[PDB]
């Protein structure tokens, strides 16, 4: 196990004002990448048992007309301050309990009310400095909207400048609430609630222009088991296929109920794109056999010598047919991807042709390249190289870009020979190298980064 590092602690935090670059990173790039993950995976004696477990580390990429300068800090959590002071696991994670519920923002980044927010699965974000990256405190909303479990991977419509989210209240009577909020307001307006027995993990959602698309796979929790059962989160969920994965269709305007689509089982963690053309919805989701992939996650697993038990995934296209019938899918590449990204801002939601993410196809090393998926004529492009494990691939489309795949990808590397990581740039149209710049230590494997302008 080379990539081993990859899952160890990072205790170094450093703001250096420049990093050794190689190559020459484009003039027009002058905003901030930031990166989010896990990065502490014990406290003392007490090991943090899942990968999804680890304490929330930021790291700032922030780029001036060529010079790349860095920071990263630990993300000042209740979670994390109680560990730091009392050297004791301290809050309920993932997959992890102490002998209410976290505030480890481990897994992605964005705005809300242009505040700086790092999000987990739990209801209320953690605010940050992007200047500082220091923790101002808890983000709360300002409604009477209830939620237990929610999704670090909000949608942004740009053209009504709303972020889009579902939150799950987990009671005797459970609702999917699908949410909007408005630029310069942290209010939440209820879109719809959808009432559900047993809640479904849903780590992300479909949206096109008029419907929000909630793919619940069959991988679902008793919400009295969660609040009774002395049993860490996630193992409190059980894969029942014979319920097969369910469609819900809401107007994300008037909330109203468009209908209900079955198909057979299956579980994906990650959306990539879907969109409506005549009649039909199609969404690209990057889909499991079954919700094995969730206990494969497990850090002793990662750590360890078998390495092929990693269940891989793959981009299936499902058709949902409005007029009536089954829901069925088509693959749209025999690459196997996760972490897919694609040119966001101006292609998520419609027709398109590009996705960007980490092949774990198992061809030479696992998770040992970056891939480029071009739909249209089928085949891919590839970027590896010894010994590196790279990271989400974030798009980034040039000024003034008449095509998708006209800007930049960068990626968080880890070299295993160098027991160091480095951000690779490259060029989105042909997927070569353009520069990079040495980070003095390893960045462990993270989910979660955006560019912000
Ligand atoms: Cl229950
Ligand atoms: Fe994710
Ligand atoms: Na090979």
């Not at 953690?126 to 990256?133: G, K, P, Q, R």
């Not at 879907?274 to 990662?302: C, R």
Request: with cysteine; hydrophobic share 35%; net charge negative.
């Amino acid at each position: 196990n080379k990539f081993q590092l990859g899952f160890s602690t990072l205790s170094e935090e450093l703001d250096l004002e420049s990093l050794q670059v190689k190559g020459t990173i484009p003039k027009w790039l002058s905003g901030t990448l930031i990166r989010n993950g896990p990065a502490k995976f014990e406290v003392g004696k007490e090991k943090f048992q899942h990968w999804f477990d680890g304490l929330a580390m930021l790291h700032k990429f922030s780029f001036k007309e060529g010079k790349v300068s860095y920071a990263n800090k630990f993300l000042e959590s209740k979670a994390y301050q109680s560990a730091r002071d009392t050297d004791k696991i301290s809050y309920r994670e993932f997959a992890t309990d102490p002998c209410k519920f976290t505030d480890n923002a481990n897994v992605n980044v964005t705005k809300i009310a242009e505040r700086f927010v790092a999000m987990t699965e739990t209801p209320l974000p953690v605010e940050f400095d992007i200047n500082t990256l220091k923790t101002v405190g808890v983000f709360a909303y300002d409604d009477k909207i209830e939620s237990g479990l929610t999704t670090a991977h909000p949608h942004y419509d740009f053209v009504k400048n709303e972020l889009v989210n579902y939150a799950t209240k987990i009671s005797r009577s459970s609702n999917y609430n699908v949410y909007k909020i408005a630029d310069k307001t942290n209010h939440r307006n209820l879109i719809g609630s959808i009432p559900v027995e047993e809640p479904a993990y849903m780590h992300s959602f479909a949206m096109t222009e008029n419907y929000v698309v909630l793919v619940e796979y069959p991988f679902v929790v008793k919400p009295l088991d969660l609040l009774l059962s002395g049993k860490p989160f996630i193992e409190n969920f059980s894969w029942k296929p014979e319920n097969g994965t369910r469609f819900i269709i809401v107007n994300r305007q008037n909330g109203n109920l468009v209908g209900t689509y079955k198909s057979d089982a299956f579980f994906a963690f990650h959306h990539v794109n879907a969109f409506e053309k005549q009649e039909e919805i199609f969404v690209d989701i990057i889909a499991y056999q079954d919700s094995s992939i969730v206990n494969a996650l497990y850090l002793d697993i990662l750590r360890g010598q078998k390495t092929d038990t990693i269940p891989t995934s793959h981009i299936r296209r499902y058709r949902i047919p409005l007029s009536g019938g089954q829901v069925e899918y088509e693959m749209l590449s025999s690459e196997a991807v996760e972490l897919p990204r694609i040119n966001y801002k101006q292609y998520n939601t419609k027709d398109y042709r590009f996705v960007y993410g980490i092949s774990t196809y198992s061809a030479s090393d696992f998770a040992n390249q970056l891939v480029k998926i071009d739909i249209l004529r089928k085949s891919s492009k590839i970027w590896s190289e010894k010994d590196c494990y790279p990271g989400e691939p974030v798009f980034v489309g040039a000024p003034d870009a008449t095509k998708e795949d006209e800007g930049l990808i960068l990626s968080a590397v880890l070299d295993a020979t160098n027991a160091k990581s480095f951000l690779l740039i490259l060029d989105a149209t042909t997927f070569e190298e353009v520069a990079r710049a040495e980070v003095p230590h390893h960045i462990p494997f993270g989910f979660h980064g955006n560019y912000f302008e």
